[PDB]
RNA sequence: CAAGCUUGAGUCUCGUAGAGGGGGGUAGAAUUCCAGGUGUAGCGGUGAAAUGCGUAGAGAUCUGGAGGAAUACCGGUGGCGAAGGCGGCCCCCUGGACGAAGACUGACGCUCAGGUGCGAAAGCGUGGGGAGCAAACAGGAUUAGAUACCCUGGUAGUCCACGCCGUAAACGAUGUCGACUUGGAGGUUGUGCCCUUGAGGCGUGGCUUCCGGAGCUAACGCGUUAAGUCGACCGCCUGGGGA
């Protein structure tokens, strides 16, 4: 019941945050693929367009800061 | 090796400007790769997992020249005297 | 940087340090003067620091530990074997004919265009004072009072690393592992010093001492007891705590009392 | 002529030097015959962690095509300059010219 | 890669024979037609074809009696590593008289029960039991 | 988990939502995992024989629901 | 020997996915240590204990700082490499594999004794670094003794640039290349279609995991990725000890 393959995207640009504020949990970790149901090609592009934003200071690393 | 740097060797050595499959073309397209790749192994001498491609290219060019040496000995001497290959 | 081949006892252990970048010729003429071998004896004509005397004729080469000329660029010309210090010395031609000697950084050759002064761009070879250098970049020729001359970090292969730029002071870390405060406007030079493998050189034999001007050294428990505390014994005996010639302990006892400089020593070398 | 997606973060006290930075970093590319595709300011943005002990920084996105030399220069200005706090330069394989997702 | 086509033909026969197929194929040749021109005339296979103008596919057709298989055992006796050349003084009979051995004489490929009375010997291409 | 209580939330409720919101993010598995050292051989053996026994008890559902007993 | 063709083997066009190798940066959480501030009697430890650390102020708790090693979530019998093996992000140089439509060259192929390369950890040399762990070693215990598993500390070593060593259950305990022979569940990754018209149905390619039939095997088990039916070539064993 995926989202990316459904909507027909080809790249997950990290510079959108209104999407990635669904695919991170409360603490700031990444919710696994057998829970969001994302296909396992776009899960890798998700796990890199989160780790770019965590560097570029749009998404936290933990809950505290 | 870039596209317009192989489409120069195809036109230099290729008898149709389309053929891309001749034996002299398939030796020149490896020698103008090895002699360009020698200036990458002068900086990174520990790169064995991309030295295996170089040993592959060398020992396949040796086979594609020893085919030519017994097929047509006329072409083989002028091919090595054009490329500089000693043997 | 090769071992010499064992033809005969005397070259069995030699590791040279050879370098083909150097100048195989004569030094620059208006930069020499006389540095005669003082022989370890002062005006009173007595041996004060021992072991010294002998060797080869060491003609001094003048060298610019100040680098005062701001603004003007400076091409390098060649390198030479200055036999005073254990570094190598570059010969520099400025844009208006003035030649000088400077210390040689690690990435130096014939073709570099260095530039001294306040507004120098950041590249190894350049110099600029330490309120425009960025933090972390390792420097040599660090001065302790602004304008005196290059004093800190001036050997064969040393460096000091700027770690903090607070107030109107900077904090270094010297090569002997001791932190140090320096006035924030002393004239430092970026990058290390070139000839980094002098410590690999094993000299090989006795003769490479007395071609460098070091005499023999007689250890303490050889002598008879009017010349050193360690003497005596009808055979071998060393039944006393290890001392200098002149009474003082040597195996650990600290001897620093220069109490006018302790504003700047942040932590001792451990 | 490989394209590039650069982004840098300047300090909000020095937030009045960004037209200087934009019209001085168009120089080293467009005078270096690399075309300039899209170029946006993002204003001041709340961070979500401390970086150099502050909380609001200033983002500029610059998506530009260049020869491989001048971009290999353009990181040194960001490093030895201390106006900018962070900079990321990615190698986009093609030439994007859409509006940024956070212009809305 | 391929270092023999005859022990490719025979093993396609036997592996389409014990797997209860009906029509094995292969790429053709000029020896694997003079072998399935002996197997048919003996009677081990019903009828063969050949299809194509530039690269031909030989299409055999296997046979069955009572639901079981016809070519029960089929060895291969002169193989490319080791060539067996026998003279007609010492030609072998396979299974005492019921199984043939496709001998290549000089007078065309023929079974040994005819190529012992045509008065010559030759290579022994395959036993068939 | 940072459980900020709401307006008039009773205390066992605003404590049990914390204990659930800590069990979910799972810090009591992680700080048990980093307690000792599991080598790259022992961890791989464990996370292979902890997948073959997810396979077998994903499967054996749909075979042992074919043979009745009464 | 001589002459040819396109299915073996190869090159060119456009792309796709990947912890493949080598070099230089940088980001965050934590362990330790140093300087302090608040603070008062215990902390640490095991099955219970003591050794050790604290009334010279530990342990907690807050700000600040130096440095080193490793990359939580993603992370899955998932991916890449010929094996050894390889996990944060970013940039340079570079090796393969695979699909797609074509054009081309005309067996250029397969295996390989002696050779020559790569080859985890441990070791070894010369020069740097050392936060965590940690053989030897020192102390407290359990014990009939305990040179041991448990505990408090801790040096080689782990790490980095360059040289040797060339061994492991280097394991799929299965040498490499090719052709055939019933099926079904998946996973990962390309692509031409058909009302694609949100997760649809019709296909053909490569790579990897379980269960299972003929046939084989002493059995267990293997099972189109064979240990089935074959062809080419190389390695290797011949009772246990001695070894
Ligand atoms: Mg002396
Ligand atoms: Mg001595
Ligand atoms: Mg002596
Ligand atoms: Mg005496
Ligand atoms: Mg005395
Ligand atoms: Mg005596
Ligand atoms: Mg005595
Ligand atoms: Mg053709
Ligand atoms: Mg052709
Ligand atoms: Mg051998
Ligand atoms: Mg090692
Ligand atoms: Mg070592
Ligand atoms: Mg060491
Ligand atoms: Mg330590
Ligand atoms: Mg212990
Ligand atoms: Mg040792
Ligand atoms: Mg062995
Ligand atoms: Mg292994
Ligand atoms: Mg294994
Ligand atoms: Mg073995
Ligand atoms: Mg057998
Ligand atoms: Mg099976
Ligand atoms: Mg087999
Ligand atoms: Mg067997």
């Amino acid at each position: 019941f995926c989202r990316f393959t459904a909507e027909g995207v080809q790249e997950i640009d990290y510079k959108d945050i209104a999407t990635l504020k669904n695919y991170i949990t409360e603490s700031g970790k990444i919710v696994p693929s057998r829970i969001t149901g994302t296909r396992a090609k776009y899960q890798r592009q998700l796990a890199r367009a989160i780790k770019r934003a965590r560097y570029l200071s749009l998404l936290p690393y933990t809950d505290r800061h | 090796l870039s596209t317009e740097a192989t489409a120069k060797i195809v036109s230099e050595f290729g008898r149709d400007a389309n053929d891309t499959g001749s034996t002299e073309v398939q030796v020149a397209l490896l020698t103008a790769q090895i002699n360009h790749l020698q200036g990458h192994f002068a900086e990174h001498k520990k790169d064995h997992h991309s030295r295996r491609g170089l040993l592959r290219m060398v020992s396949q060019r040796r086979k594609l020249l020893d085919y030519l040496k017994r097929k047509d000995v006329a072409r083989y001497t002028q091919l090595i005297e054009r490329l500089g290959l000693r043997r | 940087v090769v071992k010499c081949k064992p033809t005969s006892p005397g070259r069995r252990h030699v590791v040279k340090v050879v370098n083909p970048e150097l100048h195989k010729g004569k030094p620059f003429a208006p930069l020499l003067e006389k540095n005669s071998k003082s022989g370890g004896r002062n005006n009173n004509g007595r041996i004060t620091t021992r072991h010294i005397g002998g060797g080869h004729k060491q003609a001094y080469r003048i060298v610019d530990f100040k680098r005062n000329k701001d603004g003007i660029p400076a091409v390098v010309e060649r390198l030479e074997y200055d036999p005073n210090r254990s570094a190598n010395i570059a010969l520099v031609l400025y844009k208006d004919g003035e030649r000088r000697y400077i210390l040689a950084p690690k990435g130096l050759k014939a073709g570099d265009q260095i530039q001294s002064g306040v507004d120098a761009a950041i590249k190894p070879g350049n110099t600029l004072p330490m309120r425009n250098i960025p933090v972390g970049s390792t420097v040599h020729n660090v001065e302790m009072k602004p304008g005196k001359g290059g004093q800190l970090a001036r050997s064969a292969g040393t460096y000091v690393q700027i770690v903090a730029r607070d107030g109107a002071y900077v904090t270094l870390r010297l090569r002997s592992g001791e932190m140090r405060k320096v006035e924030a406007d002393c004239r430092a030079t970026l990058g290390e010093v070139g000839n980094a493998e002098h410590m690999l050189r094993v000299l090989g034999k006795a003769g490479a001492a007395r071609w460098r001007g070091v005499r023999p050294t007689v250890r303490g428990t050889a002598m008879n007891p009017v010349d050193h505390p360690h003497g005596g014994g009808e055979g071998r005996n060393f039944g006393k705590h290890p001392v200098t010639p002149w009474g003082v302990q040597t195996k650990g006892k600290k001897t620093r009392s220069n109490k006018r400089t302790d504003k700047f020593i942040v932590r001792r070398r451990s | 002529m490989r394209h590039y997606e650069i982004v840098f973060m300047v300090h909000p006290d020095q937030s009045e030097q960004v037209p200087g930075m934009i019209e001085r970093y168009t120089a080293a590319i467009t005078g270096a015959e690399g075309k300039i595709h899209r170029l946006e300011d993002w204003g001041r943005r709340q961070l979500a962690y401390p970086i150099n002990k502050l909380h609001k920084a200033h983002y500029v996105l610059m998506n530009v095509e260049a020869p491989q030399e001048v971009i290999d220069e353009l990181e040194t200005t960001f490093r030895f300059n201390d106006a900018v706090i962070r900079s990321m330069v990615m190698r986009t394989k093609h030439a994007v010219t859409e509006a940024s997702p956070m212009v809305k | 890669s391929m270092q023999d086509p005859i022990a490719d033909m025979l093993t396609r026969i036997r592996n389409g024979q014990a797997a209860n197929k009906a029509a094995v194929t292969m790429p053709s040749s000029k020896l694997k037609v003079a072998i399935a021109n002996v197997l048919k005339e003996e009677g081990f296979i019903e009828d063969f074809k050949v299809e194509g103008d530039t690269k031909p596919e030989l299409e055999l057709t296997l046979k069955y009696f009572q639901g079981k298989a016809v070519v029960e055992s089929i060895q291969r006796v002169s193989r490319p590593g080791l060539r067996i050349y026998k003279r007609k003084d010492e030609l072998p009979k396979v299974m005492a008289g019921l199984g043939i051995a496709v001998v290549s004489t000089s007078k065309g490929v023929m079974t040994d029960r005819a190529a012992r009375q045509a008065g010559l010997g030759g290579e022994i291409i395959c036993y068939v039991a | 988990p940072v459980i900020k209580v709401r307006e008039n939330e009773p205390f066992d409720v605003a404590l049990r939502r914390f204990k659930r919101s800590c069990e979910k993010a799972g810090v009591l598995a992680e700080v048990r995992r980093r307690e000792f050292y599991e080598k790259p051989t022992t961890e791989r053996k464990r996370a292979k024989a902890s997948a073959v026994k997810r396979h077998a008890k994903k499967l054996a559902r749909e075979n042992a629901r074919r043979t009745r007993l009464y």
Side-chain angles (χ1 to χ4, degrees), chain C residues 64-250:
Chain C
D64 203 346
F65 291 156
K66 307 164 261 281
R67 320 270 324 263
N68 59 343
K69 290 181 74 145
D70 304 73
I72 171 161
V75 60
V76 189
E77 284 203 333
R78 51 201 166 245
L79 321 181
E80 271 149 356
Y81 172 37
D82 166 89
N84 294 316
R85 78 192 37 80
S86 163
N88 302 148
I89 289 310
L91 165 58
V92 195
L93 166 76
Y94 285 74
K95 203 176 59 55
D96 42 21
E98 168 169 19
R99 287 178 173 87
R100 283 174 175 175
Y101 276 175
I102 73 169
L103 291 163
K106 192 175 179 181
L108 214 62
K109 43 196 177 315
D112 192 1
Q113 261 166 6
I114 73 183
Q115 163 196 340
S116 313
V118 193
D119 60 332
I122 316 185
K123 256 184 304 169
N126 297 120
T127 179
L128 71 161
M130 316 209 272
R131 55 169 86 262
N132 318 117
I133 306 173
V135 189
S137 49
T138 81
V139 295
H140 69 298
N141 275 339
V142 170
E143 323 205 344
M144 322 175 71
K145 285 169 215 88
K148 190 203 299 211
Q151 205 171 6
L152 299 191
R154 212 175 72 241
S155 180
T158 62
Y159 48 80
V160 291
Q161 326 166 2
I162 316 172
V163 301
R165 194 170 46 157
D166 51 334
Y169 262 93
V170 298
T171 318
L172 306 187
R173 175 183 305 110
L174 311 179
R175 193 49 178 107
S176 74
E178 165 165 351
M179 292 182 80
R180 169 98 201 183
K181 291 183 89 66
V182 164
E183 293 326 292
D185 201 80
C186 309
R187 190 58 78 103
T189 308
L190 261 281
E192 270 83 16
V193 278
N195 179 85
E197 53 261 13
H198 185 51
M199 57 202 164
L200 273 301
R201 202 192 310 216
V202 48
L203 292 144
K205 44 175 179 165
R210 299 175 69 161
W211 308 342
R212 282 174 176 273
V214 164
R215 290 200 77 249
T217 294
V218 179
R219 74 197 203 276
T221 177
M223 321 194 169
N224 276 291
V226 303
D227 301 341
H228 217 283
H230 293 162
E234 209 49 53
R236 289 218 190 78
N237 272 317
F238 182 42
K240 48 190 77 70
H241 297 72
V243 285
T244 315
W246 310 284
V248 189
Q249 201 90 44
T250 175

Side-chain angles (χ1 to χ4, degrees), chain D residues 3-85:
Chain D
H3 311 78
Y4 279 102
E5 172 180 325
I6 314 164
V7 53
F8 54 84
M9 318 185 40
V10 78
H11 194 281
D13 288 12
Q14 277 91 308
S15 168
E16 311 92 359
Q17 277 81 356
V18 282
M21 288 165 195
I22 286 180
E23 275 90 317
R24 268 208 278 101
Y25 295 150
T26 200
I29 320 292
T30 321
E33 76 264 347
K35 270 83 172 156
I36 170 168
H37 289 290
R38 95 182 158 161
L39 184 51
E40 303 191 3
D41 64 317
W42 280 357
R44 292 94 186 276
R45 294 279 301 265
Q46 188 102 49
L47 308 156
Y49 48 116
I51 40 170
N52 190 10
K53 261 69 60 180
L54 61 97
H55 299 103
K56 273 177 110 167
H58 186 26
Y59 285 102
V60 171
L61 191 82
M62 180 151 73
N63 206 300
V64 72
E65 176 211 31
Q68 72 177 354
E69 180 55 69
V70 285
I71 289 313
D72 285 346
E73 177 171 357
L74 213 57
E75 274 159 302
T76 45
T77 314
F78 292 153
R79 190 221 296 262
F80 283 140
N81 187 1
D82 208 2
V84 309
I85 306 103

Side-chain angles (χ1 to χ4, degrees), chain B residues 8-51:
Chain B
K8 179 65 216 65
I9 304 174
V10 172
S11 296
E12 177 180 332
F13 283 89
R15 268 72 69 98
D16 298 348
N18 204 6
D19 65 329
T20 181
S22 310
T23 310
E24 309 105 342
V25 183
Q26 294 170 15
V27 179
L29 264 168
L30 304 185
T31 283
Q33 177 57 60
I34 299 160
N35 283 321
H36 152 76
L37 211 70
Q38 200 68 33
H40 153 83
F41 281 72
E43 200 151 8
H44 318 318
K45 298 182 300 260
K46 299 294 186 185
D47 210 33
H48 309 264
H49 294 59
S50 75
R51 204 198 291 283

